[PDB]
Amino acid sequence: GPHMATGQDRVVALVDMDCFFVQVEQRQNPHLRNKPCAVVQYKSWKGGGIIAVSYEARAFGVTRSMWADDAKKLCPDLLLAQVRESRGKANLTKYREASVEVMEIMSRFAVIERASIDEAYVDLTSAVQERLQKLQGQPISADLLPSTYIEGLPQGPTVQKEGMRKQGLFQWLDSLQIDNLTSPDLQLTVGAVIVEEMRAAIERETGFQCSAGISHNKVLAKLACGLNKPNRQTLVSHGSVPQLFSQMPIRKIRSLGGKLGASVIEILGIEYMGELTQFTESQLQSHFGEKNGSWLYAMCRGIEHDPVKPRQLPKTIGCSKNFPGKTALATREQVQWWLLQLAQELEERLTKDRNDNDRVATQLVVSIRVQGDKRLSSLRRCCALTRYDAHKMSHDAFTVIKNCNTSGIQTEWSPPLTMLFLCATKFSAS
DNA sequence: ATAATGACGCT
DNA sequence: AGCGTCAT
Ligand SMILES: Cc1cn([C@H]2C[C@H](O)[C@@H](COP(=O)(O)OP(=O)(O)OP(=O)(O)O)O2)c(=O)[nH]c1=O
Ligand SMILES: [Ca+2]
Ligand SMILES: [Ca+2]
Incomplete structure (x- = not known):
């Protein structure tokens, strides 16, 4: 009836960068642009694990978590860029920094929720209502929406992609209720116009392309976003939901x-x-x-x-490394040394974080995984984080895990450790 | 022998 | 406090 809430109160977008680590490497190395290419960490074991894949390479069947040597079998021309390695582990600094580029630009338009290194939710409700004042009932041109898909359209009475896109947009715009500033569909449409601008700004100022979903909540926006990838955005209206959900796994x-x-x-x-x-x-x-x-x-x-939670910075800062199979740590000296390598990267990033974002972490969380255990974490323990000092942090971390060592001989460690993880948390203003 | 990260729920 | 779930 008239007391039936329809979840049309907000305009919410989710923006997601197209094959993000690949684009970062492609910006830096023009040779990799518009080519089948992938980002790989480590390279000794089977050429390294692939963690991001350009859309050109995807067409050959190349996927994440594939060994690079196996990917070459599907795509012999595959170009690789490898993740920076520091202290014997992967170092994602280039991507974190690329991420900040994008986040600060989105922050110019609205409150954002940083959902991952390359995704942000945007609550556009206020910006839309304001823009709806800028346009005194003025109709929205198809030209304001050059990369937008309207999910579910065209319906009823072209053989190429862009033809269908436009016919759908035309059918949507032709039926639009523009003299009603409270029409949810109009708000979404205005929301999509802004996201076009946001995405133009991101590409202009970083070179990075992305996709976006625009809808009435986060889940639909995230769903909407994946429907037309790469370099496109999708509006999913409340009306479109029954048919869309009718065959949605x-x-x-x-x-x-x-x-x-x-x-x-x-x-x-x-x-x-x-x-x-x-x-x-x-x-x-x-x-x-x-x-x-x-x-x-x-x-x-x-x-x-x-x-959409107003949060642009991560609430934890962590470093981990897995030690699969034969590489599992089996002595005290290994465990201590790797905790130190983790603690050193962590210290650099914390010190950076403290200067940039005016805050300090107050708790250190130590996580390990023992050999044979399927679970991500075998065990988590904490101590105070009082000094941004690698040697102290690594020492404290060893202290809170050292009695997990079941071994009779002091120099040995058993069961061998298959993962070490240090995470700084509980930030206070500074 | 994917990785390296993250956010948050349950008890 | 510590473990479990779900995601990029
Ligand atoms: C999913 C995933 C991503 N990543 C990294 C690499 C990805 O480029 C980046 C974001 O991941 P995704 O957004 O999941 O993937 P993508 O950006 O590469 O591709 P798409 O265009 O399909 O969105 O973070 C990992 O390191 N491990 C993972 O398991
Ligand atoms: Ca992405
Ligand atoms: Ca993503």
């Missing part, structure tokens, strides 16, 4: 890509996101818990309330 919806998603599928005996509508909120709550049941009930109707 549950695992595609953010937070449903793991075990909860799988149990939703198994317990309810369904496949697609829209099928969730046929259950009461109480039923969903009984199967998955109050919080999940409530969230599921709203979400399958395109309604979600998770706000």
Whole structure:
């Protein structure tokens, strides 16, 4: 009825950089531009692990987590750039810094939530309402939306991609309710215009291309974003949700890509996101818990309330290294030395962080993984972080994990460690 | 023998 | 406090 909330109160975008580490390497090395190429860490073992893949290389079947030697088998022309290595581990500084370039530019338009090294949510509600004043009911030209897809359109009465895009946009714009400043669809459309500008600015000032989703909440925006990649943006309207969700595999919806998603599928005996509508909120709550049941009930109707959190800086700073199989650390001296290598990178980055962002970390968290254990972390322990000093931090870290050592001989370490992880947390202003 | 990161929920 | 889930 008239008391039915429709989740159309906000305009929310998610921006995501196209094959981000590859673009960073391609900006720096013009030889890699418009070529099949990939970013790889380490190179001794099977040519290194691939962690990012240009879209040209994707067309050959090259994927993440592939060994580089295996990728060459699919794509013999594949060009590689390798991650900087410092102190025997990967060093992602180039990408973190590239990330800051993009984030500060987006920050110029609106409050952003940094969702990863190359993704940000944008709450555009205020900017849209303001822009809606700039245009005194003035119709929105197709030319303000040159890279925008309208999900679900064209419908009813062209054989190439751009032809379809435009026909969809035209059908959308022709039906638009422009003399109504409260029309959710109009707000989204104005939201999409701004995101075009934001994306133009990002490309102009960094050289980096990205894709974006624009919708009424974060989950739909994130979904919308992946529908037309690379270098394009997608508007997903509230109206588009029933058809879109009608064949949308549950695992595609953010937070449903793991075990909860799988149990939703198994317990309810369904496949697609829209099928969730046929259950009461109480039923969903009984199967998955109050919080999940409530969230599921709203979400399958395109309604979600998770706000864009005003946070542009990460809340933790960490360094980890895995030591798979034969490389697992087996002596005290190895464990101490690698904790030191981790502590040294951490200290550089913390000192940087303290000068840039006026804050200090107050807690050190130490995480290890023992051989045979499938879990990410075998064990987590903490101590105070009182000095940005590598030798102290590495020493304290050893102290809080050292009795995990089950070995009879003091110089030996067992069970061998397959991962070391140090993370600085609990920042206070400074 | 993917990695190296991150955010947050549950108890 | 410490472990588990989900994501890039
Ligand atoms: C998913 C993932 C990404 N990354 C890095 C490399 C990616 O370039 C970057 C962001 O990842 P994604 O956004 O997941 O991937 P992408 O940018 O490479 O490609 P797409 O265009 O499909 O978005 O972070 C990892 O190091 N490990 C990972 O598991
Ligand atoms: Ca990306
Ligand atoms: Ca991403």
